[PDB]
Amino acid sequence: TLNGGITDMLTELANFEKNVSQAIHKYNAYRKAASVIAKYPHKIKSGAEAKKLPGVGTKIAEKIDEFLATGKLRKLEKIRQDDTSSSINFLTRVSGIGPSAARKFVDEGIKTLEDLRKNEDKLNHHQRIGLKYFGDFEKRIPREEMLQMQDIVLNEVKKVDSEYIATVCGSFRRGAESSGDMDVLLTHPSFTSESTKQPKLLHQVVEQLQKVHFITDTLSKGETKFMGVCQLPSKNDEKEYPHRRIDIRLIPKDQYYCGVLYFTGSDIFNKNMRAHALEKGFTINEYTIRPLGVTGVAGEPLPVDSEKDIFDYIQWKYREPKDRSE
DNA sequence: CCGACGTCGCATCAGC
DNA sequence: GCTGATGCGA
DNA sequence: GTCGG
Ligand SMILES: Nc1ccn([C@H]2C[C@H](O)[C@@H](COP(=O)(O)C(F)(F)P(=O)(O)OP(=O)(O)O)O2)c(=O)n1
Ligand SMILES: [Cl-]
Ligand SMILES: [Cl-]
Ligand SMILES: [Mg+2]
Ligand SMILES: [Mg+2]
Ligand code: NA
Ligand code: NA
Numbered sequence: 001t002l003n004g005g006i007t008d009m010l011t012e013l014a015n016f017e018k019n020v021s022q023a024i025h026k027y028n029a030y031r032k033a034a035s036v037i038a039k040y041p042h043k044i045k046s047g048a049e050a051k052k053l054p055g056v057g058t059k060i061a062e063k064i065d066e067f068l069a070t071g072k073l074r075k076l077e078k079i080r081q082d083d084t085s086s087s088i089n090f091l092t093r094v095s096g097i098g099p100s101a102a103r104k105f106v107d108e109g110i111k112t113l114e115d116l117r118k119n120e121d122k123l124n125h126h127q128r129i130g131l132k133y134f135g136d137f138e139k140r141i142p143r144e145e146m147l148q149m150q151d152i153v154l155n156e157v158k159k160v161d162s163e164y165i166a167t168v169c170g171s172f173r174r175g176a177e178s179s180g181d182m183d184v185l186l187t188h189p190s191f192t193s194e195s196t197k198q199p200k201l202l203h204q205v206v207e208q209l210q211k212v213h214f215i216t217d218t219l220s221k222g223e224t225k226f227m228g229v230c231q232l233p234s235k236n237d238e239k240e241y242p243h244r245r246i247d248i249r250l251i252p253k254d255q256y257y258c259g260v261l262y263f264t265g266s267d268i269f270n271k272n273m274r275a276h277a278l279e280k281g282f283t284i285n286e287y288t289i290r291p292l293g294v295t296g297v298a299g300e301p302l303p304v305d306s307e308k309d310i311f312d313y314i315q316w317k318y319r320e321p322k323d324r325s326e
Numbered sequence: 327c328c329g330a331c332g333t334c335g336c337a338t339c340a341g342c
Numbered sequence: 343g344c345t346g347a348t349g350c351g352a
Numbered sequence: 353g354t355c356g357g
Contacts, residue, residue, distance in 0.1 A: 023353090024331095025353075025354095028331070033354085056353095058353090059353060060354090095351090096350075126350085220335085225335050225351095227335090265352090271332050271333085277332085283332085284332080287334095
């Protein structure tokens with residue numbers, strides 16, 4: 001909140017470049033500049049003071065000067081007026097509707113919530129669910145509710161097979177007082193980088209969760225990644241809890257640390273970390289960290305026995321999950 | 327300057 | 343059917 | 353949009 005005004009501006013610009021301009025790299029650029037400024041311990045008084053921080057170039061320095069003086073940004077004042085941008089931005093807020101689909105819908109005349117509801121036939125499964133829970137999905141999840149959700153998921157997974165280990169990651173693992181959704185990392189001794197000794201490992205858990213009516217909808221589902229909707233049960237007369245987004249990722253047990261590092265995030269932290277890895281000559285994914293031999297081809301997975309080992313390989317002092325919120 | 331920018335799973339599609 | 347590329351998402 | 357070689 002120290003430099004909230006500036007970070008909010010940069011974020012709005014990031015969203016515009018991603019949704020409207022479909023320029024994913026410009027989006028990352030703003031996201032980064034925004035991230036760095038957010039951690040800066042001082043109240044920025046000029047664009048020059050900001051350009052010092054890495055990720056902030058000249059263009060963003062000027063905008064900051066504009067924002068400090070005027071308290072707003074003309075570039076954004078305009079984007080806000082443009083109907084197509086306003087429309088594309090709104091549509092993208094529906095889960096399942098990205099920049100491409102949004103721009104398309106706008107071409108066909110579909111640019112509002114009402115339009116979406118009277119044209120459900122033009123939406124695929126995912127998009128139809130996003131429309132359905134449009135309201136609920138924008139609501140944050142209190143940590144208290146996250147704890148109830150954790151209890152249900154872990155206790156149900158245990159009932160399916162005691163060898164399953166379920167770990168809630170994401171912002172929750174980073175200590176956040178509220179989350180956008182629930183991200184669950186799952187492991188079972190019967191699924192390793194060596195072999196899949198048992199099929200449907202992910203399926204059965206999803207199955208069980210649907211059985212107790214915790215998971216209510218499915219946006220997508222494969223052998224290792226599930227993306228759906230869930231809801232905490234309510235008591236007598238008690239109003240129902242909002243529907244929430246839940247993601248479950250099945251990861252080879254022996255590659256748990258690379259997995260938990262990946263799933264804990266944040267997204268920007270992971271991107272910055274992976275970038276640093278490359279600068280140091282390593283490549284990291286949710287399964288392992290590997291070296292980059294001259295040519296470029298990734299080498300063999302290095303040994304990993306802790307999240308810390310990963311950090312060491314790239315000469316980065318370890319950072320608690322709570323300090324990985326960039 | 328200038329081509330890179332983290333990495334990958336699922337859904338959907340085009341070309342065969 | 344498959345593979346390879348695009349869209350959307352983690 | 354930024355930047356390092
Ligand atoms: N582009 C991305 C997106 C995600 N992630 C990893 C790292 C993320 O921490 C993790 C979860 O994805 P999430 O989409 O639930 C998230 F990011 F929003 P979370 O941090 O959980 O915040 P919230 O509470 O709002 O959900 O996937 C990643 O590596 N790259
Ligand atoms: Cl771009
Ligand atoms: Cl790998
Ligand atoms: Mg999350
Ligand atoms: Mg998630
Ligand atoms: Na800079
Ligand atoms: Na969307």
